[PDB]
Symmetry: D2
Subunit: 301 residues, 4 copies
């Protein structure tokens, strides 16, 4: 036998950091969950009981906290790049570091109409994430995402004109509920190293904000022909607004809300135009995915 | 043997309802999870295989949807009272109905600064709940609550002066993080029936809003001596603002954020006044409870 | 305002303990999650910022580990009684201790047909639990339970003869699937203190084993008229087998498995006698409860 | 813009099937959760609101149930291959079907020492899974796995000789607890189509049993130098026992159990040779991965 692939490290590292402005009194908090997995000349730890090549996962954990003490933790694209770069530079035999960060929301409270200096609310379980792959000799590849953004619209969603054959029971509809949990990812151009990442730092928060804004406005305003059609519009708009993005990926569940025929009870009308009470379905669910990039077709368009 | 207690029914009934204003185009959505458990002269279903006394849980489910079609689903205190009253009135042999409702957030989206007519966001997993016990001959007992309201403050929390003995290792502190998930319950005066509940309908939304406002402002502004002291202030204020409440209960976890001593690494200072990076602890957690009512002591105060 | 009720302590305390037989080499492991909440003369911690009356939750945590080091952790009824007794004896002003323990399964592995001396498998997420309320001057009240025991039978379950009215759509059935997650609790006679608990120690493991055995055999062998009828048989048998039990409580979800009519597709027959493929329903679910004790009726039986 | 990748379908489809032997009375149950995602000439559903190319996810759901009615659902490798093959054969424009199946345990109960004909227990949340990718013109690629197999050994685990530098605090140990949740995957040789899969049907259950047996015996018997070293031994043995496997992958968390120094309390000794009570850590956790295949090095071995 031989090792074909290997990576190892510390997962589920919870990290909080506070910034305190001693002049103004305003404090700002950041909370995340971090995973760092390393690759390199480590195969003998598996094949030969050679622990000398292992940077202990406990030490990886220590390093995450040390790095958060010595550097900004925002934007997460930057923090992940600093962290990953550290491992490949510090350890000759480590050649890749894979850093995943989930950022948790702590939104400043407004009390009596004024932003409070040191009190926060988890205003959504929506996350902002990064995946930062730092690969020695091949730069830094970053995928940024938002996830867990749960939305519903009560009309202005349709689904008709789909294939009908002997497996089909679904009724066409011209007016349905649409609800999803948005997972949207934007994949950056490869960066050559930490200097190039740093040169683009403002673009990270700006692109996350654009992606969120586009997602919400397109969901709310598109008289949707399908999940497929709506999500494509989102992606095309994000690509148009940040040239340093190469692709946008969406993964959207179709969280079904079924009509309930009550006509068996006193002739109650609760379908079609009279549908008011619905049964949210926990499972199953449609699951619709696509990855959109910029076009390069020049004929047969 | 004999049956000492029994109740049965349908749990985990997911319910959506939409209201459509055909004049304005504005739609409003409501989503909940409902449980109804019944008591009464049912013991022979357990002891004698006598199914004649069972109103099937499937029929209870149907009834929940029918009741939502025929009545408002808001405030949940009212919906639960209507639902519970139905079972004790419809079925001679059913003498109590226990209705639990969890209300899920669907907050209207603002798009380009304007409220959208039919698009919503799950802006928090915080819930608004009710427990409505309708007991034939003994009226309607309602407990209202908010839960899953997750908050953090980065300073203005203290914990010193606690008992110290041979089991104690905890350091006193004059400046710590405080974070919790608020579960707050207000227990209404017994209502004689559905008419009395209906007579107080505006008070339900108003009291929920007061409880939330008080919770947030007191958390944010109290330079807290302990979870105990802060939660008591919340409760006393809610009682002062609604005379139809008899008690207020809080159940608060103390979600610990530990300092991380980094002085072993290059003399890094990350404790006390220099604490910036902390380790959120998933478990264990303090858990602090109290039920506050109005005083009746007249001496030894 | 005044404090009507209060309790506080440490929740979610994970505890492992190993026993090592140095003669035989056999090791035995125990893992639990513990909660201890205290009551007593503590109201001034809430009303007056008086921390002097607080035994810190951190110290409660320390105490749990110390108590596990100095005493057996099995049976959990005993461990909980020792732990609770400690708080009311050690602290004059603490008058009740409420100890909840969840015991996690670590079943010894059999390797090549032989029990291994130090390797274990989590063979089920089923739990064994206790609730031990130690109340100064009023002894020790113990509720023991098993929970998370998930079972299914594919036939020999029926449900017919239930009430039918204008809310009813359910078809009677003479052959259905029955599946549940068993939560069964046996409530012990009050014990006067720790000596009386210790005097009954073998009965704890024996009664847990009886309750489990009865549950499984009755589920498997009863040609069930309803969940109600089957669960009552379980309870009556457990009561008959341990006189120091006062009541047995069951709480059982009815985890529905729906037939799927496929006759629209090529005349496929998948209902009634030809039902082979079913749709497990995640929600909603029936929920059936009862508490059974011994009879005291002497006429009208 | 243009669609670079797309797939869609139905996720979280719960499926039960029963087999009834009418001669013997013995019934056998199967329960799974299925996901099917399709690829093909579908881009216009995203770009052009062209629903004609969409086989509705509702119809995919119907098809899963129909296929389970008309075919064996075991082994899951076979069921997934039949299901995936159906979509690429039935629909000219669909060119890949990605079928994921999670199989849930329903183990036959033994009652009074005899296997019961129709009663089952969920004896573990361990799963048996498949990932079956059916790609038109490129056969069928199958990855089989077991997951959620949670184990602990109380001794015969070590971790010493790891890299030590200025980021390291971890103590070397010659005797520790090792606990994990095993996720093990074996990747089959590409199959040319459904006939080739069918030709190997007995190997699926046999290889799953081998993988489980090897996992448990190696975990229990290896005096482990590290998670890395132990998992490699597992993989090499599985490869040696099934030549139609190309690779074996393990992904193992290191679920830490920390010693608790109690020497501050009455000189209690609970570390090193006297360690009996430990604190299971929920997070963070090591995470150790590798993919093992057969060797092709002929020099520098
Ligand atoms: C109702 N429905 C389907 O049956 N398939 C679809 O995904 O769930 C699909 O392909 N697109 C939809 O928007 N709606 C759907
Ligand atoms: C740090 N700490 C404790 O150790 N016990 C306490 O609850 O967690 C307590 O009783 N009250 C607190 O506010 N803080 C605590
Ligand atoms: C099918 N079904 C019901 O509709 N109600 C019942 O609980 O779920 C009930 O009261 N008892 C049952 O055993 N079966 C049921
Ligand atoms: C204690 N410990 C580490 O600190 N890193 C390791 O994974 O968690 C590692 O690389 N291998 C181990 O077996 N044990 C570990």
């Amino acid at each position: 036998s031989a090792v074909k692939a290997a990576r190892y490290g510390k997962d589920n590292v919870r990290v909080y950091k506070v910034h305190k402005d001693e002049k103004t009194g305003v404090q700002t908090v950041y909370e995340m969950t971090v995973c760092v997995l390393l690759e390199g000349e480590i195969e003998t730890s598996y094949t030969k009981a050679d622990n000398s090549v292992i940077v202990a996962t406990d030490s990886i954990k220590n390093t995450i906290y040390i790095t958060a003490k010595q550097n900004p933790v925002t934007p997460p694209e930057l923090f992940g790049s600093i962290l990953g770069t550290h491992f490949i530079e510090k350890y000759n035999h480590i050649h890749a570091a894979h850093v995943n960060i989930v950022c948790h929301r702590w939104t400043r409270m407004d009390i009596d109409g004024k932003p409070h200096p040191h009190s926060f609310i988890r205003d959504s379980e929506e996350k902002r994430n990064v995946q930062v792959d730092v690969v020695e000799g091949k730069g830094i590849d970053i995928k940024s995402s938002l996830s867990g953004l749960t939305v519903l619209k009560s009309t202005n969603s349709q689904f008709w004109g789909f294939l009908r054959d002997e497996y089909t029971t679904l009724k066409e509809t011209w007016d349905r509920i649409l609800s999803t949990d948005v997972d949207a990812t934007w994949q950056w151009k490869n960066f050559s190293g930490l200097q190039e990442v740093r040169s683009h730092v403002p673009k990270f928060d700006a692109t996350w904000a654009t992606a969120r804004e586009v997602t919400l406005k397109t969901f709310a305003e598109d008289n949707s022909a399908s999940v497929q059609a709506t999500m494509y519009k989102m992606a095309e708009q994000i690509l148009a607004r940040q040239q340093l993005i190469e692709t946008v990926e969406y993964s959207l569940p179709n969280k079904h809300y079924f009509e309930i025929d009550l006509s068996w009870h006193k002739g109650l009308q609760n379908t079609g135009k009279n549908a008011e009470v619905f049964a949210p379905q926990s499972d199953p669910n449609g699951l619709i995915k696509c990855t959109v990039g910029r076009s390069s077709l020049k004929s047969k368009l």
